[PDB]
Amino acid sequence: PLESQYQVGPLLGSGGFGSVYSGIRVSDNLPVAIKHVEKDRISDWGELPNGTRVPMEVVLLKKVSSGFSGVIRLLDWFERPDSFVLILERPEPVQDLFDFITERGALQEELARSFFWQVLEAVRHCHNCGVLHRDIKDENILIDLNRGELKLIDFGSGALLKDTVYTDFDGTRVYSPPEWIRYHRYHGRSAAVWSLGILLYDMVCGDIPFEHDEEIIRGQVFFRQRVSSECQHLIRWCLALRPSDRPTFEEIQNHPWMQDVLLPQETAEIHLH
């Protein structure tokens, strides 16, 4: 019994992903996040190594489940008549990157470097596990404030990673690439790199670079804040109009701007404590 095992707390948020509550596992007092997803709102379904029909979100979370703390851990799940309930880990204290940037404004480059590197490691983990996130953005990144560790969350818009073209998308439009806007077609890795370019611009400028479809298609990057030449170069590279002109994850991590990254604990000591 789900109701027996967990003590429900406040609602942490709701939207396209469903409704997420703060919770406590009654057995060991472990902090958890309880996510409710309506069955009538689930368009992508999959199957587990045993053969049960579950939402794609559960399939993807199980594929990325490991000791690696860069991606949120699915602790358990339950089926109800009209919904699915996901028990997810909950860092404490925590703050999502959107709220962090809203509160603190544009981030110091040393902080953005540490955060961006951790996001890159989290996305590389997903891809290694055969999972494409499809909604990389500030709102889908939690900061574990004590450890300085970032956690990629919400696989509700995700898909199994494939090398062929994707012709469907239900992630965030302003983080979506020009090939999706113009042609309704994209390849997983190169679309992920575009979103990473939007995210990095967001970290160092305090806001996203493009609002309208026209701006995405033009892809002209204007820096509203003082940003180093190496960081601007990396951003402009990730935001190349042609998917084939975008860097690989290896090229991003070998970029001069990405050198001498702080450890997560060093990041918490300097910037979060």
Ligand SMILES: CC(C)Nc1ccc2cnn(-c3cncc(-c4ccc(C(=O)O)cc4)n3)c2c1
């Ligand atoms: C509900 C999400 C999108 N946003 C959000 C905003 C603020 C907070 C504060 N804590 N918190 C939180 C803490 N631990 C875990 C989670 C969480 C974990 C997983 C998921 C998920 O969609 O996979 C959503 C949320 N959320 C928030 C979530």
